[PDB]
Amino acid sequence: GPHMSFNKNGCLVFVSRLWDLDKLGMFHHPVSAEELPDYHTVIKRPVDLSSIRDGIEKGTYATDVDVQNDVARMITNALEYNAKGSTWYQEAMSFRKTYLDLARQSGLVV
Ligand SMILES: COc1cc2c(cc1-c1c(C)noc1C)ncc1[nH]c(=O)n([C@H](C)c3ccccn3)c12
Ligand SMILES: [Cl-]
Ligand SMILES: [K+]
């Protein structure tokens, strides 16, 4: 085995769990400026699961912790953009509380 701090398939398993648990699909794709024009004025450092998947497959995440950090940013961004108590915010809060366990479930070191 490679015995290393980047585990590509483990990171993809992590993203697959996040994807599947994202019932609103609110994390699935980058936000189009034409569809939701205010988003980019509120969220200046966007990230989404498709972009994270692209990065994992390309190798442009150094380590599994870097993937975890981008998922944390993804969640924080959704908590910023959406209003407390909204369905979106509820889902993002659920992710905040569980994403590290999802990483562990996937085989990553947290
Ligand atoms: C991707 O489309 C949206 C995403 C929204 C949204 C409204 C739209 C939307 C839709 C759908 N049709 O017109 C508009 C405007 N309003 C709030 C909100 N909060 C939020 O996190 N999103 C994300 C990006 C999203 C993506 C896909 C499905 C559901 N939600 C959204
Ligand atoms: Cl609010
Ligand atoms: K908010």
UniProtKB/TrEMBL annotation:
Signal peptide: none annotated. Transmembrane segments: none annotated. Coiled coil: none annotated. Residues 27-89 form the Bromo domain. This is Bromo domain-containing protein.
